[PDB]
Design a protein around this nucleic acid. Sequence first.
RNA 1: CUCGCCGAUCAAGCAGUUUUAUCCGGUAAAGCCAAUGACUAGAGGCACCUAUUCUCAAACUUUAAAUGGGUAAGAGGCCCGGCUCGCUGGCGCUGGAGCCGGGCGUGGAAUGCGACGCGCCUAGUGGGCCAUUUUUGGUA
RNA 2: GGCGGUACACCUGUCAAACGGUAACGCAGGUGUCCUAAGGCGAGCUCAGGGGGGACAGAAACCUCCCGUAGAGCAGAAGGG
RNA 3: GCUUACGGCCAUACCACCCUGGAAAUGCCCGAUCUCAUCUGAACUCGGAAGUAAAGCAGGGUCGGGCCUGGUUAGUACUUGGAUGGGAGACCGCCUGGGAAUACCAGGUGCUGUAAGCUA
Lengths: 157, 211, 167, 288, 49
Amino acid sequence: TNTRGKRRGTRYMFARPFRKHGPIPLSTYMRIYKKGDIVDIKGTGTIQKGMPHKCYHGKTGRVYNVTQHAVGIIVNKQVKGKILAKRINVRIEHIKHSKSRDSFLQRVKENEKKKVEAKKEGTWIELKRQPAAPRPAHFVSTKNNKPQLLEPIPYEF
Amino acid sequence: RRPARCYRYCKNKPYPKSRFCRGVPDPKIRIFDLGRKKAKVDEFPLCAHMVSDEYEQLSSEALEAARICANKYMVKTCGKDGFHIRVRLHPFHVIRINKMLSCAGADRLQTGMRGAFGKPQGTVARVHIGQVIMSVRTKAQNKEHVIEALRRAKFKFPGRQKIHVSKKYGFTKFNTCDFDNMLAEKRLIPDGCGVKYIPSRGPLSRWKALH
Amino acid sequence: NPMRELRIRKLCLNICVGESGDRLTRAAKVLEQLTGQTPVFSKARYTVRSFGIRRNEKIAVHCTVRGAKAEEILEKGLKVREYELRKNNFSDTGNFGFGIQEHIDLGIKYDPSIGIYGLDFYVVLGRPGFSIADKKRKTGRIGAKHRIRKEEAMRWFQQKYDGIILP
Amino acid sequence: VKVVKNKSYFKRYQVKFRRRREGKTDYFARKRLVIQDKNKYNTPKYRMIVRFSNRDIVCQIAYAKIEGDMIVCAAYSHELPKYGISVGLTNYAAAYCTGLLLARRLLNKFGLDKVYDGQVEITGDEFNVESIDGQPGAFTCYLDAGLARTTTGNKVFGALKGAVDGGLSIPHSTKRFPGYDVESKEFNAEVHRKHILGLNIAEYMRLLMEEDEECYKKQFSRFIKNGVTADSMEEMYKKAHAAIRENPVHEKKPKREVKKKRWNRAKLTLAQRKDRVAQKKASFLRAQ
Amino acid sequence: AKSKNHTTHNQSRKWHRNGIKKPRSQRYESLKGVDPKFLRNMRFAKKHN
RNA sequence: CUCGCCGAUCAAGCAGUUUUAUCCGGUAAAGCCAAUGACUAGAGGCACCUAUUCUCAAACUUUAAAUGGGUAAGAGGCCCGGCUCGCUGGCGCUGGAGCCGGGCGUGGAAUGCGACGCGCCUAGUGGGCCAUUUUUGGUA
RNA sequence: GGCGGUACACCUGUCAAACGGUAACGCAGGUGUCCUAAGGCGAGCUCAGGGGGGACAGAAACCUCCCGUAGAGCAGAAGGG
RNA sequence: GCUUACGGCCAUACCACCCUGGAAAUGCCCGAUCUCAUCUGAACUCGGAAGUAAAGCAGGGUCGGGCCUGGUUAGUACUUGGAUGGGAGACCGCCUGGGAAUACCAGGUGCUGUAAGCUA
Ligand SMILES: [Mg+2]
Ligand SMILES: [Mg+2]
Ligand SMILES: [Mg+2]
Ligand SMILES: [Mg+2]
Ligand SMILES: [Mg+2]
Ligand SMILES: [Mg+2]
Ligand SMILES: [Mg+2]
Ligand SMILES: [Mg+2]
Ligand SMILES: [Mg+2]
Ligand SMILES: [Mg+2]
Ligand SMILES: [Mg+2]
Ligand SMILES: [Mg+2]
């Protein structure tokens, strides 16, 4: 069978991108991670301290504890057929702010920006998102765009 | 050895002779270019291939036997300096053979399928559908001899092969209808058996060296 | 032009004796009485039986002279060469060097105990501004129009010392 | 000889950081110096930057941000002629005054210049400003030596001594101050006060006149033409220390609106870049 | 007498039989594992307001 | 058993499914004129050296899918004010967190469904076999 | 079955089908140690290799210059860094 | 526009060669008494101001290498799902969706934050 090593199979996930080796850019160190914010988990082989396990590389959770160099994350991990809330300690070099909820917070502020206009104008502009509706009826002009006759080309070996 | 019916299909992953697969015997074919290989591009304009129609693996012995069959017919019909045969399949996939399974024994660590991973037996060339097996470049008037030389070498190969007279000029990657026009514009320079593509996007000193 | 004066930066010399022992420490005294400064011993990189050396043993001693004392020792060393050298003694990167068989021809009396050692003079020619590649902060490259060439350093030997360069 | 700088060399090549290729920033030391603990949540981690050119001393205070660290206060050594120091703008005494200027200027804009006066009279001994209960805490920062080799007597510790005497709470020890004997591991204070007030400069001005007055006029040419003699060295820097603690605030210069005349030539356009090749090709064909 | 070594064949059908329930993130999540210095001051900020 | 429907898809909440947004990966393919390794042929320059060329990798890879994994799609939200702290500190608001009060439904993707809600006890089983596809050993 | 082997407790790469997991007496290997530093920290330094040179000195001793993305080294297997 | 200090992203920033530039500033440069430092004041450290563009640095140049971006490759390769499709098989076609990479070609080559200073 396989080995139960903590880094078995992490040859490529913990490696660094091509021509992106060396020291970690310091902007990643000066990012503030408060409690309850959504962060991604992407382990780096450069910082061998506070590494997340390979099962959390690519997962996303929220921060519950903040320390000097690391952050406590609550991550979901499916073991066999149950999903468990894992509290893992990961240094800030292996995490980053998740832009998943940023699209939601952008829409929340934009929803509150457009409904206060209704209280000042008297409209009911719908705020709900809608799937891609069927294409409406349109006229396709052929003034300077004549339909070109296409034909299947003969076979060439 | 074992007949080629047993190692015909690309059933296993490519198993090359490397740091891990040690003990591979030397392939049967060691020479891939024959004829007047030291010929210029304008000397052998015609080119004909032996294109493979099946996704199989050709043994190194078949590549060696078909090379000799094609080489001997080109010498007697076009002279020893009137062709340049290029076997374009190098046997890199190593086929394995299990032990000589016998009745029983108090040694050899096994008698049946116990520890069945076999030792390297030979080398085959995994060919794809549409992949060239052998290429022959000759003069324009030797087309009938090349088609026949490659036709006789198909019998040394399993599966189905097609003999296709390429539109490229010799062993290059440029069509005959565009080859002579690119020589006039100094975009191609003869480099050994083929040409070297010279773009208009280098130092201008290299452009002055051509004109 | 004044900032391109082809001056000498350092005159490096070394005594490569066979192995360590009393012969080496007496060879280092030859350099300190020639250069006026305590030299530095050099250990062997590997172990070579055909040379009689092993790893991490002092087999050579060397020294470095920088100021006006460097061109003074170079003047005494070129007297033994009769103010003339070959052409291949000059490197394509400027600086050159030569060798002296007997150190007694450098202006000192021979001691019967201290055997006559042979040294190896290699002068590293320079130019005002070459220290930018040695300083730590803002370390920069010299450049093509400022580094010394072979024929440029040969003319320096023919003008400052009136030397004869053998073909 | 095989070429090492081939296409595969530059393809696989990974350039260092710009501040690393230029040899200005030590990112190994910067990571441990400017990065704030994560349980601080944007608490500014200040640092005192001391840099030396061939003619000027720079003293800055900044805190790291993602878009680039923001300079809070900056004091230069060419601002000393305003306070009396006309020459020797890069010595250990000017470093103390440039650090003292940065310390008194920072506390002036933060409104706590009346508190934390430091040492008005210079003793040279160990001094650390302490925060008074009930009063706003003392400004705490750290020394950013940069690439300077922190040897005992480096002028980065003169600006460090000038800042801790101005009211800044910078942690340090007297091991790297000029006057720390390594074999006895004892620190003498009055010998440090000599380098602070330039007494070690006055001794050099005196021994040159007593040995070779021609070499004295070469070493201190601008000292004698500015009326700065060896006997007025200690008192000149003392007047600057008093003048700095009185008027530390910097007055910016009014920006002069100019014609915006760029001197060097601009890049050749794609038309000029192609026509130059078309002209070289035509010139090569006429010659043959 | 050899047998089958390892299998995950029927497991997915057994997992979704009673459903793969996500962990219920209850309101006011617990404070176990937080920084003891942070919890010490937080318990001082609660006994004085 | 706790509820929900009763008592108005009230709305939440949920999903072996999509949608939107956001990350994760190094397999297929591709590449080796890019690195590591393997390999064929000439050619140029003063065996190498340079520019090309044939053919490859499962324990190689610049590059890189499809399918897939995680997360987010609101009142447990958003915004505002006050207060507490022994933690943090130039700056009782500098951080931070906690507590309290107030304001604002156009519940702010689609579809479906009562919550596969919360427990307790628990038998049987723990020899499996087969097919499409993927895939290892083996001539099979 | 026995003999052999240990696939019996572990580790690397692969198998493994781009989350994780995933078998065979699958593959290529490693382990029952070693280290008062080969642990900790600070400072300085740059390596492998190649080239030009330079008494004895040569294909390899030492000095020196230039080039050198790490191609060296990091106790060990391999991968990562 | 430019010169520095600290930076952010970390080659559109690198590499080679060529040319131009010193207003301030920078750099080289001038010295070793003190602090300090080495075999050696080269470096490091310290003291200084005779020279001003040789180098650094900056800005240009190259049908430059590299890098970056886009096009082409290509709806190609591959791939989700489907068939009592084809073929002895190897494999292939179609249906339903998703969709690459090199060669090749073209363009571009640092952007910017805080602070201080200067209009050759
Ligand atoms: Mg294994
Ligand atoms: Mg383990
Ligand atoms: Mg550790
Ligand atoms: Mg059994
Ligand atoms: Mg079993
Ligand atoms: Mg079983
Ligand atoms: Mg049971
Ligand atoms: Mg049981
Ligand atoms: Mg077990
Ligand atoms: Mg998978
Ligand atoms: Mg110039
Ligand atoms: Mg280019």
